[model samples]
Target: PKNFGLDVKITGESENDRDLGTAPGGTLNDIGIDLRPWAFGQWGDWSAYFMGQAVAATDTIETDTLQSDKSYLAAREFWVDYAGLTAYPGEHLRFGRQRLREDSGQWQDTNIEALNWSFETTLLNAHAGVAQRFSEYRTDLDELAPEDKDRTHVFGDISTQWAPHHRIGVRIHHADDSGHLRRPGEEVDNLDKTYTGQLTWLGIEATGDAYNYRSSMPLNYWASATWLTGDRDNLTTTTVDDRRIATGKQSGDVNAFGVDLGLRWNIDEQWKAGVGYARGSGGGKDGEEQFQQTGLESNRSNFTGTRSRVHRFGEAFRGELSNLQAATLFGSWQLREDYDASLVYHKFWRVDDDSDIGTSGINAALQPGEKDIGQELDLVVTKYFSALIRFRGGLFKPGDAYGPGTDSTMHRAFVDFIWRF
Candidate 1:
């Protein structure tokens, strides 16, 4: 209930899986909470508001030492906003810790710490924003160093949509990996210097309740193209000319693109069906580029660390590697008033041949590895007990090992429930 000026949300999950190679043999638990409150007001054609959310989660039970530590903690999202800045008249500007989600961002919802702006009218809407990740958090502990500067990264995006039957639009996004490229005594360049661009077309129409499972509603169609271009360390060389190296100069640009489409059909009686497809570009061309991309060196443990990991290099050089492609298909069926079943199929094919691996300046055969094809199957069941309570379970299966003779397999499962008030 929207009572006064406060709201609350709570969530939790319990799960079990066999063969995880962990102790207590098969059970884990998770719990979380979220709270948000906003002050609303309007002044003539101008309006302003301030909203904030706080979230926290609990750690999972572990039976083995190899299991990761619990990761439940409180984060900050204190933000303020203003709308209808007269400078642009119809345009609006928002500042503070805000969240950004564009198109496929539906699959992932993480807030960015930054400012954003949007412009809207009868025929179109345009939006753009920039964000940076702070150094307070670290992703990899094993690679930590006291002298390492804060991880500073930057991201920018812009999107515009057409009107009425606004089924089309284009979006561009770019992020820099500044931490690695910063010079001595300078602010760490968290900007890895990578960028992504995309174009999407979305269509929706209301259809008469001809089949009537619940109320008749319109079907929806969505399609999108996303192109990612930037420096890739795994592809090309990071350093300047090295006469000792046979691969020659490596640095160059890299580009990858993906296509996506989906459809939602209102099936009979409170039921619906939805399906989606997606494919992207990126994979070394032949064996030579693969070799260059996979720069390897002998290590004390017989395992070689990548230049990206060991030397902290960025972006792959030209003639280093080609790109691969991936395809995915997913479908969901809504049966109960708030429950559904879903299954997903994904396949990855290295568009290039493995025969070219040994030619790059980097040593070939880093580890007895061969690139064939890879695929994954995910099956899940979900249901909503109420507006905030929900349950979900799923399994993951992958096929086509990347190693020369080894077949790889792993299994995972999860179940969670959420409550909001």
Candidate 2:
């Protein structure tokens, strides 16, 4: 007989940012579902399995009229697995649209059309895969040009248990972009021009947990580092006035690296404390020297005890890891069987004083010599109504990071309700 299961999660959230104009923030609804069906008879020593997800989200936030009232639905995953295959001594294969995550998911977490091969045994586990990224935009039938071309990626990882409670792994990923042509209704001096580039990254990680559920005191630790190198050919640049700037050919020598270390200790059955530090290589004046992430997901946390939702540096900063150093101290307490609260403090600094701090939009040219980027305080509370339902609220305040204008002090508040089944 085959077994099938369904899991559903629904969440509603509200967020406010005073610096972005306090128009009374709005609400967001996100829904997700996971379906799994497996064990459909055995072929020799192999079994079949299927797993997939459906997601939908909507936002009523009036930040932008164009995006204020819209709903989106997506197929997050649809993949199949064939286990116990004897083709390889201890290897199995899975193919189709799947999600790829690596190195504690600080970077390179995305879905792709992939063919994956995995091997597992008591002593070792490894995976290797190749994938294709679909075009980001669609073309109209009436249009003569496409928005962008598809990209390809190759990735692999191998890991082994180094000690009783420790594991170590190494991962490598490479991506190639064919670029795109100018579309209609777009002003361009060169319609035949395309942007092309290649990126490669190598990462190593070690993680350990000595915490036992029955133990009164617990301890956990993790550390990882990644090295990046790549090249960008025919890179495109633009000025503040929207004028095209050319750099002829650019070297992708990005010889950059990022490192993270974290440790957590349970002070008691109800209280836990942790600290984290992360640093990414920064460049003086050359863009290629700065550390670059393969993808945008940086799980680096300056605040928050939750590993998945960790926020980087100041919540208001919203800057990439390049040229940045951050550290955080956090503690969590279980108030009751159903409720928990946490507090976090973060301090940030510039790894490269020669690099500009604010390069986004209006603050592009405002380079400050001060290395201290300021600090943030975050407080959050969560209540579990049941195994499937929960509520969360959080407040964040920042000091002296946004420069001396308008208001350097910023505040943000959010409330959310989630249901899972």
Candidate 3:
């Protein structure tokens, strides 16, 4: 029996009109500090866990996502578990680097290095895994983000309890890429020097206890449907005169489809409200219609019933789910968990009026048969003074597919401080 922990983070961000109007240093600022130290143990049935990280930022900040403009150190999770074989009661078998999540992190959350199996029962649930990502064990990255170089991942899921509180699931994912697509002078420090792929995704999900906020179950739901199958290779990077090139290559065979639906309502015990709709699947002339995911998501959630988890697209246009079309509305509150709140609204569209829409934070550029791609408003709050404080904000407005001198408005704000020892 042993446990040790320390997690401290201080983060900040403020980037207003960050290039929406395109051109000029567009307001940028940042602050950061992150340190995570953890350990846990047990022996009779064996268990172990570990966590590590250290980060420092500025140069326009990053609390995640390729971080580095300053300091670094990381090895975020280390694991080993074996619940004595399995008689249910949350059966287990885990090894090396951990945390691969699901439950609307879109599909799988990050943390890699595999060998996993789980089966949590009380109605049935299961998981199986095989992951890969050789490094980014961080010390300032030694290159491996080209979609995690040599990539390979395999996943599985199963769920039950189909009546009475409802739950349903079936998911499968696969990926393969031996990394390539950068040839003829590789200086690739990245500007999108494509990669290879052989994807597969299939899904079916449902919930009604969705985003449970201590469930009174008034009305809560979520739904999903997806399909993706493929083969791909891409390379098209350019910037010459100061070098950075790999001018063209595209090979494809991908077919896609996706959908997400939501509903939440409590209206009591401290108000709540919600609405959502999602879609993916663009214009395919014969193949390639966007609809991608499985690149490990952090699409965050809580579906806004508030316990504070957000960014299901649009915390300042953090978009993805390819091809795209999103709509969300929310309202939330709480006073019992110390405090909590959420206010979100979003709208973005571009299901191929002329293709191209994926991964966004809005850096302008899009206007070929315009399909109104902008609108957002976000707010999230939490408090527990001395530590565990949060506030996030975003406001972006730009439409008409952002053509003509962009920037109708833009904003970003974030503040977080979490401490525990």
Say which candidate scores most in TM-score: 2
lDDT of 2 by residue, 1-421 (tens): 5355555554444544434332223223333232222223356554544444333446432111010023323344556667666656678687766656554446555555689888877778898988874522212122323222355678888989987667888988887767653443344442234335677889998876522222332677778898887765434344434434443444445577888788887677667788888888876334565775554254433123332243444333444566778887888776545666767777777777666442111122223565666566766666776233433333443333345542334443444444433
Each prediction's RMSD over C-alphas, in Å, is: 12.3, 6.5, 22.4
What range of 10 consecutive residues in model 1 has the weakest lDDT sum? Answer: 299-308
RMSD of 1: 12.3
Worst 10 residues of 3 by lDDT: 60-69
Count clashes in each candidate, considering only residues at least 3 apart in sequence or on different chains: 41, 0, 2
Better of 1 and 2 by TM-score: 2
Reference-based lDDT, residue 390, model 1: 32
The better-scoring model by lDDT among 1 and 3 is 3
- TM-score for all models, in order of appearance: 0.57, 0.71, 0.32
Ranking by TM-score: 2, 1, 3
User: Tens digits of per-residue lDDT for model 3 on 1-421?
Assistant: 4488788888888888665755556576778888888989888788889999888887536575321148878888899898988666688899898887776787876788899899888788988888887877887667767757777888889899968779897999898887777776566663343558788898899898787677866889899998988887666565565456676667888888989998988878888888999998887853376677777787887888666778898778888788888988889888887889888998989888787777556665677998988789898889875368888888988889876687568888889888888
What's model 1's lDDT at 106?
21
- lDDT at 128, model 1: 67
Clashing pairs in 3: 20-407, 21-407
CA error at residue 159 for candidate 1, angstroms: 6.4
Which ranges of candidate 2 are over 4 A from the true structure?
A: 1-10, 18-69, 87-91, 135-149, 180-196, 210-218, 233-252, 296-309, 312-319, 334-337, 354-366, 385-401, 411-414
